[PDB]
Design a protein around this ligand. Structure first.
Ligand SMILES: *[C@@H]1O[C@H](CO)[C@@H](O[C@@H]2O[C@H](CO)[C@@H](O)[C@H](O)[C@H]2NC(C)=O)[C@H](O)[C@H]1NC(C)=O
Lengths: 49, 49
C-alpha cells in the first residue's frame, strides 16, 4: 500500500550481464522496446517495488 | 468464435498487400523460444473470443 517512489532515473540501466544471467526473470520489457534500456536515460521514473 | 485468428507480433514491419503465415515466435522475454521453436514458444497467432 505504501509502495516506494524513489526517483531512480537519469542513469544507465545496463543489462548485458543481466540478460546473460539465466536466473534473472524479465527485463526485455514491452514499454518502448526490450533493449531500449542500456544507454537510455529515464525522465522521472519512480521505483515502486 | 475462436476460428478467427490474429498474429501477436511480427519481426519485420508491415508491408502493403502481402500475406505472412509465419508460425514461429521470436526470442521473446523469459522463455523466449526453445531452440528455434517447439515448447515455451508463445504462439505468434491468437484467436478471438
Ligand atoms: C541484487 O540481486 C541481483 C540478482 O541476483 C543481482 O543481479 C545480478 O548481479 C550479477 C553480478 O553481480 C550478474 O552476473 C547478474 O547478471 C545479475 N542478475 C541476476 C543474478 O539475475 C545484483 O548484482 C544484486 N545487487 C546488489 C547490490 O546486491
Amino acid at each position: 500500500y505504501a509502495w516506494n517512489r524513489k526517483r531512480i532515473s537519469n542513469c544507465v540501466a545496463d543489462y548485458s550481464v543481466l540478460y546473460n544471467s539465466a536466473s534473472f526473470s524479465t527485463f526485455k520489457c514491452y514499454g518502448v522496446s526490450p533493449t531500449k534500456l542500456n544507454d537510455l536515460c529515464f525522465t522521472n521514473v519512480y521505483a515502486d517495488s | 468464435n475462436y476460428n478467427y485468428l490474429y498474429r501477436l507480433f511480427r519481426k519485420s514491419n508491415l508491408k502493403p498487400f502481402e500475406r505472412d503465415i509465419s508460425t514461429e515466435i521470436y526470442q521473446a522475454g523469459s522463455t523466449p523460444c526453445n531452440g528455434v521453436e517447439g515448447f515455451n514458444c508463445y504462439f505468434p497467432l491468437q484467436s478471438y473470443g
